[PDB]
Symmetry: C3
Subunit: 114 residues, 3 copies
Amino acid sequence: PMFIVNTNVPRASVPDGFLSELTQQLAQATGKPPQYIAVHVVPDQLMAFGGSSEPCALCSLHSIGKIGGAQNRSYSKLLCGLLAERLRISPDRVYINYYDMNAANVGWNNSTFA
Amino acid sequence: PMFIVNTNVPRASVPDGFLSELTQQLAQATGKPPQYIAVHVVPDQLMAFGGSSEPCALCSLHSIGKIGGAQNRSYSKLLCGLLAERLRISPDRVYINYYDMNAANVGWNNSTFA
Amino acid sequence: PMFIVNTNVPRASVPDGFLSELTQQLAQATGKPPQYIAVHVVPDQLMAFGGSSEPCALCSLHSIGKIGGAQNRSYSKLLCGLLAERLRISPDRVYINYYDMNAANVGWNNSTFA
Ligand SMILES: O=C(O)c1cccc(Oc2cccc3nc(-c4cn(-c5ccc(O)c(F)c5)nn4)ccc23)c1
Ligand SMILES: O=C(O)c1cccc(Oc2cccc3nc(-c4cn(-c5ccc(O)c(F)c5)nn4)ccc23)c1
Ligand SMILES: O=C(O)c1cccc(Oc2cccc3nc(-c4cn(-c5ccc(O)c(F)c5)nn4)ccc23)c1
């Protein structure tokens, strides 16, 4: 899986270990092996939510399967929880786009997963 | 909705009020409540369009509904118009990816919209 | 087409000519005209692959057509090869999301491609 979070929170508020924490939690939530989970945090961004510059986050999770109604609700609770705890971002100022990707549309290691 | 614009235009050349203007314009164009519009501008980027580095922009709009043939044509004119006036980027050096997202695939406030 | 690469490799390690190289290698791989290829490189990123912060890259390619099983395998070999050669990133730490976009959902030059 690939997880990306963009936020207006400064880099200084991103703790040591945050990328590992995201990796960790996503591995268990998805049941995917952690060595295949990529994570990307992008702080200090010029962004607004509802026209307000208070802390917010715009995120994506791409996965081959393990994407669905109930699963995405559980990921949103998990990710909003972490963003609130570690970055002090209110859950109602977080958006996450989920993508169930076809294996043929994911490149890795000179090939694709199909 | 979520709107992102990535550009090689420098930060200092992004005029003040730009995020608020995008927020309001996207609200009226989509008919979505402005409270729920998120906008993100990423200046100073290392990018090329047709292999040249004159000003350009790479954008995306995600929405649950309000996406379609005629709407996307209208959005593209509106957004290219704004980028041209504010950031001085020619419309022929702007791309916008539109995504009609399923409510189940959009996380927010500890849950999804489904 | 639109190609984005985000990496933790430092900006100084991105060769002059890299954006041009991407543009023309993709032009030939996809058969799309290079004047319509947009490329975006984002160095110095906070990211991990498998929880490790060794060099890695997270990429996407959006195109109207020229996306499929064999083509995407070929693009992956090509892009991993380029990233290995120029950025010294191992192919097992590269991910590429491929998107076959509907022409109605790609904005350009005040309209869409539909
Ligand atoms: O075949 C084996 O022996 C073996 C042993 C250990 C691990 C292994 O790899 C895997 C096992 C199970 C699910 C796996 N899922 C993935 C996987 C990767 N994605 C994924 C990554 C990035 C994206 O941008 C994306 F859209 C999807 N989604 N799932 C990769 C490897 C897996 C395979
Ligand atoms: O339920 C209510 O009582 C109520 C009252 C006031 C406002 C309200 O919120 C809404 C009303 C109508 C459409 C709405 N659409 C959205 C909405 C959000 N997206 C959206 C946001 C981010 C993305 O990445 C994405 F793919 C889609 N697309 N639509 C949010 C709130 C809405 C709901
Ligand atoms: O057919 C047209 O409407 C048209 C109009 C003007 C020029 C033109 O030149 C072309 C000839 C052949 C393939 C072409 N492909 C493209 C093209 C652009 N994309 C493309 C760009 C960015 C994206 O984010 C994306 F999802 C797709 N995918 N294909 C553009 C122009 C082409 C094509």
